Amino acid sequence: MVVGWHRPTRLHIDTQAITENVQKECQRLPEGTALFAVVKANGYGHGAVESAKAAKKGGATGFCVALLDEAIELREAGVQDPILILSVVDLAYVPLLIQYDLSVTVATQEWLEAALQQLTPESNTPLRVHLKVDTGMGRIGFLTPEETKQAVRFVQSHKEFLWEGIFTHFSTADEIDTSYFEKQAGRFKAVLAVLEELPRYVHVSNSATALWHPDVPGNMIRYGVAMYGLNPSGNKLAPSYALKPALRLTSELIHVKRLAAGEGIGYGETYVTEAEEWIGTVPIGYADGWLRHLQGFTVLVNGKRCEIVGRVCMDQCMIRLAEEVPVGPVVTLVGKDGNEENTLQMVAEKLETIHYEVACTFSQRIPREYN
Template sequence: MVKSIYRPTKITIDTRAIRKNLRTVSQRISKNQALFAVVKANGYGHGAVQIAKIAEDEGVDGFCVATIDEGIELREAGITLPILVLGLVEVSTLPVVSEYQLSIPVATTEWLDLAIQEYQRNPWKQPVAVHVALDTGMGRIGFLTSAELHHAYQRLQAPAFLFEGIFTHFATADQADTSYWLEQKEKFFAMIETLPEQPRYVHVTNSATLIWHEPLGNMVRYGVAMYGLNPSSDALDPAYPLVPALSLSSKLMQVKKLPVGSGVGYGHTYETTADEWIGTIPIGYADGYVRKLQGFHVLIEGEFCKIVGRVCMDQLMVRLPHEMPVGTRVTLVGVDGQNQITLQDMASYIGTIHYEVACLFSERVPRVYE
């Protein structure tokens, strides 16, 4: 999707906030714990390459992405630090994984058998670094039992692989009730203690674990908190300050006074109850500003202005308190005067989490780094 640089809608990323969040976490982990910055999903909507370069400058030890393509994007941007792909990959992609020196997860012995067979037919350039995934209660990917883990360990002695890491993912690290988190923690460490050797990286600590529990293992996967977002949304207060990095702004492109009884937007879902000033803003659901945000608000001159009528593909309309000049700044996420709109505010309104809201913003909206 082409970036729309000739309209005033833009996302601004405060690079100082990213740096501050990284420095905060660096002070909370020990020197023997590697810090991997998670930049999957285009850096949670913030821009993967740009955030990775900031994180690299701040001294992180590696990166986590979700797909092979995301890893390749970082490599082609000049990133040489270790990159761990968190999503499962097909055996047919292993030559590419090897070529770009990516690390990948493994979750079944069947996959390992197929990979060994493929390597015997057509060896890739260098061993593929693998991180063994353990399913301790997430139900997503990973080995369930110590017996399965030992079968996997035996296969990892093949020349096709480098046994680089082992990990799990906590399901409830961001919740007040710690009982399930403790169950997963105990199961993970009980399983890895049965191995003949430990790999280079043992990692279970994500943002939520670091904030509300303890930095376990020798590698930290620092994701949403790096962007200044609370991993629990608004369920728990973070144990230390997080500085949000993303703001979203635009401008009023048309302002007009509609008489009482005028319809606004598709479906005639809003009708003026008096003579009302209506402003049009160039952003819509194709930009990731979803239709469910009808009835939400933006900030203009420090005042909350309600979104009226359905959000269109490329535009939306707001009710203004009075006539305002065309070109007036509009804040959709961020601070204006004494008021603020957060990603969490948007998420709460539409019934989701701020992770999803940030990831929804499309490539059509330019990212500006300040």
């Protein structure tokens, strides 16, 4: 697939915003605490490499990725810092981990026992492994205190290995009620407790934890959404410091026409003109990530809100303009214009999801520009 360069639709990524967002968080964490920038899913749709480079200038000394291929892309970009693949890697790819000196998470001894084989008798390239203990997310990890204790000692029983860290992940750190959270921490504590040695990286925090549960054991935080300026808790809580939106979505009217009252517009004729109306055509559709369920949403033109009317097409949608306008004026889908602003949170709410998903859904067909 290609990216719509010759089309007015565009995604603007304010890099400095990321940097600012990262710097400010670094300032609120102890001097013995590292900031790892998690840029998975192509930097949550903003672009990994750039998010990665912007995150570094802010104080980040490590990176968190979700796939082997994503960790490799960073290396290929010149990223020379620790990179942690947040999930289970296929044994068939162990050698790749050694080649790019990537850090992997381990969730079972089975993987480690098999990983040992296919691993040089004494390699000068030990495999950096972070053991994940699952005290509540229910996804992956050891359900120790005993299981981890066995995993760790096994990891140290072999020069082929090198355990960089041990971590857990909270499922409700963005929740008003903190009862469940406190339980996960208990399970993590119960469990470093059974050990006698600790790796260099003991991490448990994500954006939400870092913002609302600061006084929590650990020396390294995995900073995600917050660095792109998005409130990790939707609109349930206020960040500890003013985040700064890094994503803007722009397009332009490429056709403007007046329709008589009583005319149907779009598929299924879900909409019918109520009177003389000015309808403008915008070159962005669901195939670009501007989902169909966005119909009643309003975008910006010349500082005024305009209702998308009618079914959102695959490659475009229609907005009822306020007053007659030529084609060409810029249409702000996400971002500020005049006294009005469209937040990714707003789009998420219209879609009944979280901005996490909205940002990740924006197709690659939409060119991203960084400044």
